Design a protein around this ligand. Structure first.
Ligand SMILES: [Mg+2]
Ligand SMILES: [Mg+2]
Ligand SMILES: [Mg+2]
Ligand SMILES: [Mg+2]
Ligand SMILES: [Mg+2]
Ligand SMILES: [Mg+2]
Ligand SMILES: [Mg+2]
Ligand SMILES: [Mg+2]
Ligand SMILES: [Mg+2]
Ligand SMILES: [Mg+2]
Ligand SMILES: [Mg+2]
Length: 73
RNA sequence: AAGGGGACCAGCCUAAACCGUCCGGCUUGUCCGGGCGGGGUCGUGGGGCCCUCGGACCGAAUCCCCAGCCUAGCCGAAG
């Protein structure tokens, strides 16, 4: 089963990285502890939504710093 | 079993594309989920979004009234 890696763990990957593991391991170990959530059609919209929200903040921050860069010097 | 001949007819509501409304989750959102309204119900596919042109008659399976009907009866010829 596909899941999203909530907390960065060892020998698995990056925080937020999608990883497919044996479902029983996640049903007995990962999900009850709140360390993982399986990848649905909705949390893809929510993961694209938070990544694109960090991008909506980033594109504002760096562009404002570049406009102020055009103001200074 | 198909079919033919008869009895009888009546076709519809939703899930979901779409919008709106509130809700509450914290993970702060063009986020998700859960409610309600609207929008929708197709097979020579059909609808949703975008735009173009065009813009009364049907009709309940629900309701009301009216004919009609059963739960008593009545008249009813002449030794
Ligand atoms: Mg590994
Ligand atoms: Mg705890
Ligand atoms: Mg810098
Ligand atoms: Mg300087
Ligand atoms: Mg057969
Ligand atoms: Mg037949
Ligand atoms: Mg009805
Ligand atoms: Mg009559
Ligand atoms: Mg009669
Ligand atoms: Mg009577
Ligand atoms: Mg007489």
């Amino acid at each position: 089963m596909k899941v999203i890696l909530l907390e960065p763990l060892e020998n698995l990957g990056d925080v937020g990285q999608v990883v497919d593991v044996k479902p029983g391991y996640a049903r007995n170990y990962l999900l009850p502890r709140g360390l993982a959530v399986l990848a649905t059609e909705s949390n893809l919209k929510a993961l694209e939504a938070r990544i694109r929200a960090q991008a909506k903040r980033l594109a504002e921050r760096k562009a404002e710093a570049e406009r102020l860069k055009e103001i200074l010097e």
